[PDB]
Ligand binder design. Structure first.
Ligand SMILES: *[C@@H]1O[C@H](CO)[C@@H](O)[C@H](O)[C@H]1NC(C)=O
Ligand SMILES: *[C@@H]1O[C@H](CO)[C@@H](O)[C@H](O)[C@H]1NC(C)=O
Ligand SMILES: *[C@@H]1O[C@H](CO)[C@@H](O)[C@H](O)[C@H]1NC(C)=O
Ligand SMILES: [Cl-]
Ligand SMILES: [Zn+2]
Lengths: 595, 198
């Protein structure tokens, strides 16, 4: 028989045994995350070890099918997913050395704590307390201490570890026939093989930098508005022409600007839309929130939730006897098992989180008829972009009075949509220059374009130039300011947060045309529209089997990542921001430093 | 006056169903065939007759009746039909294309699913050629997927042909077990023994 027909036969054997061993791992992972027990730890660790021992053996067996005499692109896609060596191309003493720096980094990050210089008995961890100083404090020197001491204690311990981490990850990727480790991360977008839908790994860098040039008119008007409003909370500390100090942006790293809404609100006397107080008067519970979420998905023609959804999911915090990990998660266990783990309070944010995690289940339910290695998103940004356009329609005042949570005699004016859209751009637009330069710094560290004696020199030369954020203190090369973030210490690709944000409004504007919506894009509700649900489902059904450039064309009609739907969304905000920044300098000077 | 009923209670209301590769055939002859056991319909929902009418079952009289019983998944019940292609239809149980008879299927999840997995139900995954209609292949010979003769052992490009089902109750429908009975009506130019009630 031919070597391709021996590969179809090998994958038929694999798909039967991978689907059995992945269910046992996922069911043991579910039982721990709902019932934290040492026996539930050993069930989770043993079922996940059998699945990793199986996937290691089948990776070795898949390498005997050369991937050169195989012409079906469907068979070729799941062999190369299984032929991925990873760290097995390295030597065995360096494969344990690379795993040593990776486990030490998460240990220094999670168990690193900072003690205040007033009392030595009290110290502060990051996630409680030091996140509360960076979010809610309005004193300059109080959050200047919490910003600097997190980077002068925990970022100092990660500097000699990160220089060894880059070298071994580059040895791993060069042995896997890439250029560097940043080239291996860009391989999630490589679509070599299909005519008319090709995409190279270097093409991602050029397409990210091209879309970012159009965000800068919208972003530097948001930067000029936030800076003019932060001159009232911290006077004699902000320059009218300078950058923003890094410890005043609402969190530890300046990743999101969402905690700046108390100071940058346009019309502060008008309250936001919050149907949390309207929920308790109608006596909503966690079941009502989630049945109104799956009512929304059948209105666009997607399926309702399965019988085993309502029998096996955890939709409520089970009390202080049953201890569960209370993070909202959608679970695709395989073999028709779809569960959502969530500890749902009767709030507006849990009502939109219910539409988020159900948008993940509806996408897991759609590609269930694929082979096992093709059951994922089209790329890494596709899956979170689908869950984000469901919360986008559900939070509209159109949708919120069609289910009866707003009053029928409710009038929305222009002094509330600016309050809505600016709160969005603090979260959505305010994270895109952070996401773009943190990957552009990492892509050049792996490429060797930044030598290790100039890491924090070009980290702050790019933070001034791209984000418009200045350092409050000088930093030499003993600091490692990127690795103070979770995703840099824990070895995660970060450009998926950039591409998801552009896919989200590309997805939303396409389903908005199909629903035939009247006016502004931020008022779009795709509910009661089966043409918007059928255009989405033709992408959701493919999973990982087609090009992501082809799956993007099944909804949007274009083959590439596009930023014009994002700028169309914030168009009433951009008009109001350009009128407000008339007496102020729009832009920053990278020469100004606050020290 | 009624006569001896046909033993369908030891077919449908059994406790042991077969694997689909080793399906159990039962010959039914010389009795009155009461097809009004359809009143079990609330678990017994699937009922599809080919080549004969469902209501005109007692209108016709037959020589022999073959009942074939096994367990498949929920997503493979569509393969128990004339002119179908799949894993079950090609290597496990093939219906004729001119098939006269009925296919009865029902969900068996609260009877054939274990929390640790029901690994007792098997199916043939690999075979050198498609099955003939009503052929039963029960061999456990090592399938040769490549060009080496495989030496009677399972290794690279040499697979064991039979795989299991591993039924668990938290599966979705389509992976939950379904008990299937296939009734096959013969006319062998003989004294037609199997008749409906008059
Ligand atoms: C590739 O393989 C799949 C399943 O093995 C098959 O359905 C398809 O026809 C093959 N060819 C192409 C061009 O996709
Ligand atoms: C989905 O299931 C719910 C729960 O019974 C039901 O009310 C609804 O009508 C179903 N929708 C469809 C389209 O089957
Ligand atoms: C769909 O339309 C019906 C009837 O007009 C309405 O009651 C319901 O609220 C709508 N659902 C939405 C907008 O989600
Ligand atoms: Cl930083
Ligand atoms: Zn999500």
């Amino acid at each position: 028989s031919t070597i391709e027909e021996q590969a179809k036969t090998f994958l038929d054997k694999f798909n039967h045994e991978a689907e059995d061993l992945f269910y046992q791992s996922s069911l043991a992972s579910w039982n721990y995350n709902t019932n934290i027990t040492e026996e539930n730890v050993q069930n989770m660790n043993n079922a996940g070890d059998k699945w990793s021992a199986f996937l290691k053996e089948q990776s070795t067996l898949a390498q005997m099918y050369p991937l050169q005499e195989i012409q079906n692109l469907t068979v070729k896609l799941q062999l190369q997913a299984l032929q991925q060596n990873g760290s097995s191309v390295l030597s065995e003493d360096k494969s344990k050395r690379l795993n040593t720096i990776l486990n030490t980094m998460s240990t220094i990050y999670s168990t690193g704590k900072v003690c205040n210089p007033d009392n030595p008995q009290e110290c502060l961890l990051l996630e409680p307390g030091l996140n509360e100083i960076m979010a809610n404090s309005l004193d300059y020197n109080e959050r200047l201490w919490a910003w600097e001491s997190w980077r002068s204690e925990v970022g100092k311990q990660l500097r000699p570890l990160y220089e060894e981490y880059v070298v071994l990850k580059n040895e791993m990727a060069r042995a896997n026939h890439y250029e560097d480790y940043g080239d291996y991360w860009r391989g999630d977008y490589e679509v070599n093989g299909v005519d008319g839908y090709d995409y190279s790994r270097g093409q991602l860098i050029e397409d990210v930098e091209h879309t970012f040039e159009e965000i800068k008119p919208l972003y530097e008007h948001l930067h000029a508005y936030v800076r003019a409003k932060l001159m009232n909370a911290y006077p004699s500390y902000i320059s009218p022409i300078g950058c923003l100090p890094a410890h005043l942006l609402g969190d530890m790293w300046g990743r999101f600007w969402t905690n700046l809404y108390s100071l940058t609100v346009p019309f502060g006397q008008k309250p936001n839309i919050d149907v949390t107080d309207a929920m308790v008067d109608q006596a909503w519970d966690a079941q009502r929130i989630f049945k109104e979420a799956e009512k929304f998905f059948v209105s666009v023609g997607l399926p309702n939730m399965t019988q085993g959804f309502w029998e096996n999911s955890m939709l409520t915090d089970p009390g202080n006897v049953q201890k569960a990990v209370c993070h909202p998660t959608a679970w695709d266990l395989g073999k028709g098992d779809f569960r959502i783990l969530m500890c749902t309070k009767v709030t507006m944010d849990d009502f939109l989180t219910a539409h988020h995690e159900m948008g993940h289940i509806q996408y897991d339910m759609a590609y269930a008829a694929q082979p096992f290695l093709l059951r994922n998103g089209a790329n890494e940004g596709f899956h979170e972009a689908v869950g984000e356009i469901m919360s986008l329609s559900a939070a509209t005042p159109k949708h919120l009075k069609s289910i009866g949570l707003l009053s029928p005699d409710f009038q929305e004016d222009n002094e509330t949509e600016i309050n809505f859209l600016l709160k969005q751009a603090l979260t959505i637009v305010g994270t895109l220059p952070f996401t773009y330069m943190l990957e552009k710094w990492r892509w050049m560290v792996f490429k060797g374009e930044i030598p290790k004696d100039q890491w924090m020199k070009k980290w702050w030369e790019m933070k001034r130039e791209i984000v418009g954020v200045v350092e409050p203190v000088p930093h030499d090369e003993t600091y490692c300011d990127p690795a103070s973030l979770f995703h840099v210490s824990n070895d995660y690709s970060f450009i998926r947060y950039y591409t998801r944000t552009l896919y989200q409004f590309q997805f939303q504007e396409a389903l908005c045309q199909a629903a035939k919506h009247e006016g502004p894009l931020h008022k779009c509700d795709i509910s009661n529209s089966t043409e918007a649900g059928q255009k989405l489902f033709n992408m959701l059904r493919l999973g990982k089997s087609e090009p992501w450039t082809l799956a993007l064309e099944n909804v949007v009609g274009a083959k590439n990542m596009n930023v014009r739907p994002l700028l169309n969304y914030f168009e009433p905000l951009f008009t109001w921001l350009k009128d407000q920044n008339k007496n102020s300098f729009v832009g920053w000077s990278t020469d100004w430093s606050p020290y | 006056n009624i006569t001896n009923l046909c033993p369908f209670d030891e077919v449908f209301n059994a406790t042991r169903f077969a694997s689909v590769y080793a399906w159990n055939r039962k010959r039914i002859s010389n009795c009155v065939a009461d097809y009004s056991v359809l009143y079990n319909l609330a678990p017994f929902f699937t009922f599809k007759c080919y080549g004969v009418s469902p209501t005109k079952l007692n209108d016709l009289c037959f020589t022999n009746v073959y009942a074939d019983s096994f367990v498949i998944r929920g997503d493979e019940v569509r393969q128990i039909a004339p002119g179908q292609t799949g894993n079950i239809a090609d290597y496990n149980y093939k219906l004729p294309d001119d098939f006269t008879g009925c296919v009865i299927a029902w969900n068996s999840n609260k009877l054939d699913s274990k929390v640790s997995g029901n690994y007792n139900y098997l199916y043939r995954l690999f075979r050198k050629s498609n099955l003939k209609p009503f052929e039963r292949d029960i061999s456990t010979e090592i399938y040769q997927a490549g060009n080496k003769p495989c030496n009677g052992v399972a290794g690279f490009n040499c697979y064991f042909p039979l795989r299991s089902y591993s039924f668990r109750p938290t599966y979705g429908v389509g992976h939950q077990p379904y008990r299937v009975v296939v009734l096959s009506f013969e006319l062998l130019h003989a004294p037609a023994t199997v008749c409906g009630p008059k």
